[PDB]
Design a protein around this ligand. Sequence first.
Ligand code: SF4
Ligand code: MG
Length: 268
Amino acid sequence: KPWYPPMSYSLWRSLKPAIGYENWHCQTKRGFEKARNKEPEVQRLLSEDNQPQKIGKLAQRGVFEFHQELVRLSGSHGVEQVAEILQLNQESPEIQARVLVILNNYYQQPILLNKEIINLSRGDEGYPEPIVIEQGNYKFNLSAAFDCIFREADDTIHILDLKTGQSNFDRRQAHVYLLAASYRYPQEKIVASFYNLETQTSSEKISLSSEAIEAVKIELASLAKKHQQQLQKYKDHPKDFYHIFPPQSGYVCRYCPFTSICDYANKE
Ligand code: SF4
Ligand SMILES: [Mg+2]
């Protein structure tokens, strides 16, 4: 069990705002998700998934089920029985409506039926084992979960992330996925794309030259070091939490999972 500093698309997002979303990025939220998560209040507030999360997880299980018994796309009752496997009758009404829209959307056009599926995840498997990445002499554990892997006719490995809602596409997630994929199919050409199951919209195809791969490695190593330094500082200065993870307050603090426990929450 050799310990190495962690990194993920979630951590990268927690550390750098995406260009164009800088005003909706609060470092104190990262200081709650890491570095204070093991306090009971933070762990409780982090156990409850919002509706946007449960919608997506149900949809991932939806495509998984549609492909476990293929009859559920060839028969006339598939969407209904998949909704039964999803126990969608136990969810709230709005969840049911959104999910049914998405399930019917995949029944109308199953995007992976035409494809040679290497793996289709159920959405409940958690993070795989981390891959150790070596930049310089620094090594860090990258964690990445592929929603789907298939092989194109040209023998290109295609990583597909399945999304729902208004969620845009952060190409940094695709960068994480391409980097992690290179260590599982080292000899193959690898591409990544997004697909929203609720908008039936797809992204273009994303690839990375070797130069861009090393660039992503360098940035991720820098951010892992910074994360560890800040965690160490909070350990060294246990009373200065809001200094080390500085708050950016406002209306966006009505959407934080931690509004109830953040001393700088805007309550307006
Ligand atoms: S309530 Fe606002 S200031 Fe506090 S952690 Fe959440 S986003 Fe940051
Ligand atoms: Mg997904």
